[PDB]
Amino acid sequence: PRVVPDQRSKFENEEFFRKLSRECEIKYTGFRDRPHEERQTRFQNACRDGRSEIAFVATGTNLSLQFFPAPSREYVDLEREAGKVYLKAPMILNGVCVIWKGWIDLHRLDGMGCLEFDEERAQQEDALAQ
Amino acid sequence: GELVRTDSPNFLCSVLPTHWRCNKTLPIAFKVVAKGDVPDGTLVTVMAGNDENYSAELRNATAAMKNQVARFNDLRFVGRSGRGKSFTLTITVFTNPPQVATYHRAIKITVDGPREPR
Amino acid sequence: PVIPAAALAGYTGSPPIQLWQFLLELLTDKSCQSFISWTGDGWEFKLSDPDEVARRWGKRKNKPKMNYEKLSRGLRYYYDKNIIHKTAGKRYVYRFVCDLQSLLGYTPEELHAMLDVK
DNA sequence: GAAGCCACATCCTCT
DNA sequence: AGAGGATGTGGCTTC
């Protein structure tokens, strides 16, 4: 059971998701016990590799992110704004297909983001399960 | 051991104590069990945090799935969860796409841990 | 005592005196130079008679069974916290690595002269 | 007062 | 001689 029956309901009902639908404050959680310089290079170079560790400060819910579709391009941006970085990463959070979206200040190592349902991925997944 | 459902319909995990000392080996080896089929060798990771500590420092938070079982060797919680507060575990099974199962009010970590009254 | 090293280190009767603060107090007391003294190189000192230092530390902390074996463990705990480091290769020789100058208000040269260290 | 944070005090295993 | 892991203890502060 990779997913839940009411795959769509859970997202629009359950408080866990609703709390993360709106623009929540996010932050890079990588190497907290390291100089700020090292946390900056590590974080950027890692995005270039299509990965990073983000957590919604407010609720403290950590998530591991893979910026690829279910060497990236449209998933990890760097142009959209000199300094910031716009990330995108799909996953199956608690049996509900979703996609993480947010940005991060390459210097502050923080920013904002949210979880918006994924009509397509959910679709397919609910197919394999029939 | 005795498992217990997580916030994801595809994963289960062993039972963690309700209050433990930080950086202290746990009483029972932590495990992540998959219901569905997960290819052996798949990496499973664990993270923790809350409103008082957004990302707790852990130790040995990485395990490889084998026969549906991710057996963590000596998982320890270093960071604290705050007076009376607990951590929310976030389990990540790196399939493609990656599957993640959370677990709220999982455990409380403090400097001392469970201590007999004085 | 040339200066109030204990008080200038943070000791104010409140939380009991800390091991590093106590050693400081012996290092600034001419009558103890027989078992503990500055080596003349910065804030580096050598416990010429560890067993004695230990007894004092013991009596001062009301821990009769205190011995150098246990006290040195106390010192090693300072390695990470960067309060005191070990001089590799020199028996019973340690060094304050914090900012004693700001705390005490004297440079090593000055304090050494004040204590007539040779 | 319970429940947290601290700085050890004790005991040890290893090199 | 010295390093560092494991765990218990009393002083003290915060909830």
Side-chain angles (χ1 to χ4, degrees):
Chain A
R2 316 215 314 153
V3 282
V4 59
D6 58 285
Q7 225 199 302
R8 179 175 247 296
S9 312
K10 273 260 281 201
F11 181 91
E12 302 183 70
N13 297 61
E14 201 157 56
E15 183 68 15
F16 175 55
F17 292 115
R18 276 184 164 172
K19 212 97 67 69
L20 306 169
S21 295
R22 306 148 63 184
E23 285 286 66
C24 298
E25 192 211 329
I26 65 173
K27 187 181 294 195
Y28 168 51
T29 73
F31 313 71
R32 291 275 293 290
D33 47 77
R34 297 305 305 174
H36 191 69
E37 187 274 344
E38 197 174 299
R39 294 194 77 223
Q40 287 177 314
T41 68
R42 279 191 191 270
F43 170 88
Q44 207 211 208
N45 292 341
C47 294
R48 289 248 173 62
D49 294 9
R51 67 192 147 81
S52 181
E53 323 184 18
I54 298 298
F56 299 112
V57 181
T59 165
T61 297
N62 289 212
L63 286 183
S64 204
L65 309 177
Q66 210 102 84
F67 313 126
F68 286 130
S72 340
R73 262 175 172 175
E74 67 130 70
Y75 288 101
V76 50
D77 211 309
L78 282 169
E79 315 304 347
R80 193 142 160 181
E81 181 162 357
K84 294 185 182 179
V85 182
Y86 289 62
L87 312 161
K88 190 195 294 279
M91 70 196 69
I92 300 177
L93 208 184
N94 288 161
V96 169
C97 296
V98 196
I99 296 176
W100 188 83
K101 300 190 169 192
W103 51 279
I104 293 296
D105 181 313
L106 229 157
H107 292 282
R108 282 153 53 69
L109 308 187
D110 73 83
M112 224 129 294
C114 65
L115 305 178
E116 41 173 283
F117 192 98
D118 192 343
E119 196 73 350
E120 301 228 58
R121 285 300 305 175
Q123 181 68 53
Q124 327 170 189
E125 285 296 333
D126 231 301
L128 169 63
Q130 295 120 185
Chain B
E2 194 219 357
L3 300 184
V4 57
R5 34 189 171 71
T6 73
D7 294 318
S8 190
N10 210 200
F11 304 96
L12 264 47
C13 60
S14 59
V15 180
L16 289 166
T18 50
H19 184 197
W20 204 242
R21 182 165 173 176
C22 80
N23 186 230
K24 183 193 223 303
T25 297
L26 296 162
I28 70 310
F30 185 70
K31 288 176 178 71
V32 165
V33 179
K35 307 272 271 309
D37 285 317
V38 176
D40 288 354
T42 305
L43 304 174
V44 192
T45 215
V46 49
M47 294 177 286
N50 59 209
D51 62 47
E52 213 159 314
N53 180 168
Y54 73 106
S55 192
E57 154 167 30
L58 279 35
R59 281 179 62 197
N60 314 136
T62 287
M65 188 79 93
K66 181 72 196 321
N67 291 329
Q68 311 305 289
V69 190
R71 225 301 283 270
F72 286 86
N73 178 247
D74 196 29
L75 172 61
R76 317 210 199 179
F77 295 72
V78 177
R80 289 79 105 312
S81 43
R83 189 188 185 90
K85 307 277 265 297
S86 273
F87 275 143
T88 296
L89 291 190
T90 299
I91 304 174
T92 293
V93 186
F94 292 82
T95 54
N96 203 56
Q99 300 187 66
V100 47
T102 54
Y103 190 37
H104 298 87
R105 293 180 302 284
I107 187 176
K108 181 173 78 178
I109 280 77
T110 60
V111 180
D112 288 345
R115 283 188 68 176
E116 220 57 60
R118 271 187 270 170
Chain C
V2 181
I3 65 293
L8 288 164
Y11 184 41
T12 61
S14 55
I17 191 177
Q18 275 164 38
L19 175 56
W20 70 278
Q21 300 174 319
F22 173 75
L23 292 177
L24 216 55
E25 183 183 294
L26 301 186
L27 280 178
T28 57
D29 182 307
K30 293 275 284 180
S31 77
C32 308
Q33 311 185 84
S34 40
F35 52 85
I36 186 173
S37 62
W38 305 94
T39 71
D41 163 358
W43 295 126
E44 155 176 271
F45 59 108
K46 169 187 174 62
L47 308 180
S48 49
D49 187 356
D51 303 26
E52 182 59 26
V53 181
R55 289 185 278 270
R56 311 255 187 169
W57 175 228
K59 183 175 172 179
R60 169 71 109 117
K61 263 295 227 53
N62 182 196
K63 288 287 184 302
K65 43 282 190 182
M66 177 52 84
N67 64 18
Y68 178 63
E69 305 269 296
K70 294 165 180 198
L71 177 156
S72 93
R73 181 82 194 58
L75 287 173
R76 292 193 285 283
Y77 268 120
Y78 291 148
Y79 297 176
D80 273 26
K81 302 168 69 192
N82 291 310
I83 294 283
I84 283 177
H85 283 178
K86 174 74 183 80
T87 290
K90 289 184 188 304
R91 158 143 57 74
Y92 316 133
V93 177
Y94 299 87
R95 179 194 302 276
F96 285 93
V97 300
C98 45
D99 211 306
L100 273 184
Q101 194 170 316
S102 303
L103 261 71
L104 289 176
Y106 294 97
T107 69
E109 271 239 72
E110 275 154 28
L111 200 72
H112 296 175
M114 289 156 68
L115 298 163
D116 177 47
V117 163
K118 268 180 279 58

